[PDB]
């Protein structure tokens, strides 16, 4: 359904749909705010569903699930020149642990989305974005500040959920739409046992193939250096149809944020040069236009921004207020952003392609493909260049 050697992935993530992220849909979290006090806002989906109870959580999510992404967005994605979508989903859509507060029902919408993808000639990756116990402690895993994916039976339950995803979506029914099943989004390499993580990856790889599936297995890089996975899941060991997913951003640390625009572009070009050297097919599964960490709650509910020196002990760079609204952006920030997007697009098209995070946000412009495209900051057509050849690839 896809030629990783010849075609280039040009997609967007359908984030904030099946896994709630506070910075993407702040209106679902804001009702819990007491005036200016943010101490009572649930910090993740786990706490959001627990605080609401099953009845209200199901009513609010059914409304979110049915309106956040619909068939019209798939038509729009296709009309903009995109050929792929990445769909994050948490383990709770398939199985609940005893005492889990999550509600189900996401599957019905996942299946509707696969038919919309088919109708619009869009290919997809199904991404297991959150595992039981949390694989990274991020709010996008469903459970913030916990790192227990490798404790107790959490790894085995993840494998059972993947077996379900393998039997339903890795067979012949969706062979023309599904071009990858991503085993686990962002396992936080530095706090996990890497040997157990590789064993988990190998177990998922073997389990999928054992079902008769030929679907590409996508492994996230677990924040390891470029080339680290060169010797794992290789054709020399009879392991094939494997893709490495790299996520790239330059706003999650004081050092990265302080770079001038030329240095940000140099780093983006370098991502293109180093990925070219890897031996596995690779795709930049997540990246954005963000040059700051100013979007409200991007670092998590009740956490400020490093950009204005209000978090993770970073120095003050500038005020975030003026960057919250794209209509207030200075002419220089608009040019810097377009330059940054074009450098990234060239670097990722140098290898397997790219998937922007994300299609839409309620009001965070740096993270919304729709908003940037409508304001002329994201090239349209996507091959358009106002700043051609900033990297000099050969």
UniProtKB/Swiss-Prot annotation:
Keywords assigned by UniProt, alphabetized:
Cell adhesion, Cell wall, Cell wall biogenesis/degradation, Cleavage on pair of basic residues, Disulfide bond, Glycosidase, Hydrolase, Secreted, Signal, Transferase, Virulence, Zymogen
- Reactions catalysed: Successive hydrolysis of beta-D-glucose units from the non-reducing ends of (1->3)-beta-D-glucans, releasing alpha-glucose
Q: Where does substrate bind?
A: 21, 23, 186, 249, 256
Q: What is its main location?
A: secreted
Q: Which GO terms describe its cellular component?
A: cell surface; extracellular region; extracellular vesicle
Induction annotation: Expression is maximal during the early rapid growth phase and increases during biofilm growth. Induced by caspofungin. Transcripts is also regulated by RCK2, SIT4, and HTG4.
One GO MF term: cell adhesion molecule binding
Q: What happens when the gene is disrupted?
A: Leads to enhanced susceptibility to the commonly used antifungal, fluconazole, during biofilm growth only.
Effect of mutating residue 138 to A: Decreases catalytic activity. Impairs catalytic activity
Where in the chain are disulfide-linked cysteines found?
Answer: 269-391, 294-320
Effect seen on changing residue 252 to A? Impairs catalytic activity
Characterize the regulation of its activity. Answer: Binding of human antimicrobial peptide LL-37 decreases the catalytic activity, which leads to the decrease of cell adhesion.
The subcellular location is: Secreted, Cell wall
- Domain of life, per UniProt, equals Eukaryota
Q: Does the keyword tRNA processing apply?
A: no
List of catalytic residues: 186 (proton donor), 286 (nucleophile)
- GO biological process entries: adhesion of symbiont to host cell; cell-substrate adhesion; fungal-type cell wall organization; glucan catabolic process; glucan metabolic process; single-species biofilm formation in or on host organism; single-species biofilm formation on inanimate substrate
Q: Entry's InterPro entries? A: Glyco_hydro_5 (IPR001547), Glyco_hydro_5_CS (IPR018087), Glycoside_hydrolase_SF (IPR017853), Glycosyl_hydrolase_5 (IPR050386)
Q: Write the Enzyme Commission number(s) for this entry.
A: 2.4.1.-, 3.2.1.58
Decide whether keyword Signal is in the record. yes
Mutagenesis / variant outcome for changing residue 223 to A: Decreases catalytic activity. Impairs catalytic activity
PANTHER family in the cross-refs: GLUCAN 1,3-BETA-GLUCOSIDASE I_II-RELATED, GLUCAN ENDO-1,6-BETA-GLUCOSIDASE B
* Biological function: Major glucan 1,3-beta-glucosidase required for cell wall integrity. Beta-glucanases participate in the metabolism of beta-glucan, the main structural component of the cell wall. Can also function biosynthetically as a transglycosylase. Functions to deliver glucan from the cell to the extracellular matrix. Does not appear to impact cell wall glucan content of biofilm cells, nor is it necessary for filamentation or biofilm formation. Involved in cell-substrate and cell-cell adhesion. Adhesion to host-cell surfaces is the first critical step during mucosal infection.
Could you give the subunit structure recorded for this chain?
Monomer. Interacts with the human antimicrobial peptide LL-37.
Family note: Belongs to the glycosyl hydrolase 5 (cellulase A) family.
**What is this protein's record name?**
Glucan 1,3-beta-glucosidase
Organism, per UniProt? Candida albicans (strain SC5314 / ATCC MYA-2876)
């Amino acid at each position: 359904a896809w030629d990783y050697d010849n075609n280039v992935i040009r997609g967007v993530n359908l984030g904030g749909w099946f896994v709630l992220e506070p910075y993407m849909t702040p209106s679902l979290f804001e009702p819990f705010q007491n005036g200016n006090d943010q101490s009572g806002v649930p910090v993740d989906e786990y706490h959001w569903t627990q605080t609401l109870g099953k009845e209200a959580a199901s009513r609010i999510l059914q409304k979110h699930w049915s309106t956040w992404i619909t068939e019209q967005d798939f038509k729009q994605i296709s009309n903009l020149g995109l050929n792929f979508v990445r769909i994050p989903i948490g383990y709770w859509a398939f199985q609940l642990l005893d005492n889990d507060p999550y509600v189900q029902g996401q599957v019905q919408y996942l299946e509707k989305a696969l038919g919309w993808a088919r109708k619009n000639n869009i290919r997809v990756w199904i991404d297991l974005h959150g595992a039981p116990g949390s694989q990274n402690g991020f709010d996008n895993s469903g459970l913030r500040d916990s790192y227990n994916f490798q404790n107790g039976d959490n790894t085995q339950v993840t494998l059972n959920v993947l077996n379900t995803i393998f039997k339903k979506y890795g067979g012949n029914e969706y062979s023309d739409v599904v071009i990858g099943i991503e085993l686990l989004n962002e396992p936080l390499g530095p706090v996990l046992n890497m040997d157990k993580l590789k064993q988990f990856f190998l177990d998922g790889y073997n389990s999928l193939r054992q079902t008769g599936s030929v679907t590409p297995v996508i492994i996230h890089d677990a924040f390891q250096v470029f080339g680290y996975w060169n010797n794992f899941l290789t054709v020399a060991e009879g392991q094939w149809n494997v893709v490495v997913d790299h996520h790239h951003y330059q706003v999650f640390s004081g050092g990265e944020l302080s770079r001038n625009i030329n240095d940000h572009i140099s780093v983006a070009c370098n991502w293109g040069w180093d990925a070219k050297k890897e031996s596995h097919w690779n795709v930049a599964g997540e990246w954005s236009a963000a040059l700051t960490d100013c979007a409200k709650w991007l670092n998590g509910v009740n956490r400020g921004a490093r950009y204005e020196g209000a978090y993770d002990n970073a120095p003050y760079i500038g005020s975030c207020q003026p960057l919250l609204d794209i209509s207030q952006w200075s002419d220089e920030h608009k040019t810097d952003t377009r330059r940054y997007i074009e450098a990234q697009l060239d670097a990722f098209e140098y290898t397997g392609g790219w998937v922007f995070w994300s299609w839409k946000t309620e009001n965070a412009p740096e993270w919304s493909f729709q908003t940037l495209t409508y304001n002329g900051l994201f090239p349209q057509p996507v091959t358009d260049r106002q700043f051609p050849n900033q990297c000099g690839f050969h």
